[PDB]
């Protein structure tokens, strides 16, 4: 039940550093840091990249159906009245419905308004925002899958 600082992503393209608000959603932050600590993202990829919307990432199955948690497959939401989906580079926990969150995050690329109805924000990107846009410029298909591998190499709950 310890509180690490900023999480280092080390993607195939470069480094991105996420800031996490221990002020507002600590349970997701502990979960995200622990999965980063144990090495649960080492080799997972950005499977769903929609242009000018978001980048869903992080699944050992690579399907966009997989994931568990440190509590086990589900935990509640933290729909906080302060965090609002505003601009690019917000980090947020990808959902499948009410109070069901696994281990899939998504980094957002534009202001979205219908999102914060039903998703938990916990984070924002803070180092090399242009590299996110380079991930944003990745070739897609009908199901919005990348042709190459945009995978996360390593991740560090540093500090």
């Amino acid at each position: 039940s310890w509180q690490p600082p900023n999480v280092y992503l080390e993607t195939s393209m470069g480094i991105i550093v996420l800031e996490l608000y221990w002020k507002h959603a600590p349970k997701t932050c502990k979960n995200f840091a622990e999965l980063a600590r144990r090495g649960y993202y080492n080799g997972t990829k950005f499977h769903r990249i929609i242009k000018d919307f978001m980048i869903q990432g992080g699944d050992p199955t690579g399907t966009g159906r997989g994931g568990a948690s440190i509590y086990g497959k589900q935990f509640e939401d933290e729909l906080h009245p302060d965090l609002k989906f505003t601009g690019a580079g917000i980090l947020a926990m990808a959902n499948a419905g009410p109070d069901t969150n696994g281990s899939q995050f998504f980094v957002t690329l534009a202001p979205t308004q219908w999102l914060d109805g039903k998703h938990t924000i916990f984070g924002r990107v803070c180092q090399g925002i242009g590299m996110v846009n380079r991930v944003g410029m990745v070739e897609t298909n009908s199901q919005d899958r990348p042709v190459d591998d945009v995978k996360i190499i390593k991740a560090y709950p540093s500090g």
Binding site: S12, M13, E19, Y21, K51, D52, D82, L83, K84, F85, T86, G87, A88, G89, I90, L109, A110, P111, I121, R124, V125, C126, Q127, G128, I129, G130, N133, R134, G136, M137, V138, E139, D148, D149, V150, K151
Partner: protein, 98 residues
Amino acid sequence: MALTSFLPAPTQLSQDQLEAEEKARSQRSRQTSLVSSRREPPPYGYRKGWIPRLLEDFGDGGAFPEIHVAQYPLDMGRKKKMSNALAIQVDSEGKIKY
């Protein structure tokens, strides 16, 4: 066999070389003194009451969800015009996929 074994190690230096060695070492040091572009300040950590308005404020980038103003780091998220350019797509860790 190379002259490096037939010529003595640089313990032989004329007075002109002694002055020139100090001059050549300082010349290298002077050419790297051009610091170039002084970069933007990072945002404040205790963000109460601060509102980003310029591109400069973002510094390192990223939008602040706790600040209730529409933010557009590096002009992302702004409604783009009908540009016919295909995306400058870059491979995993390689060069730009031309």
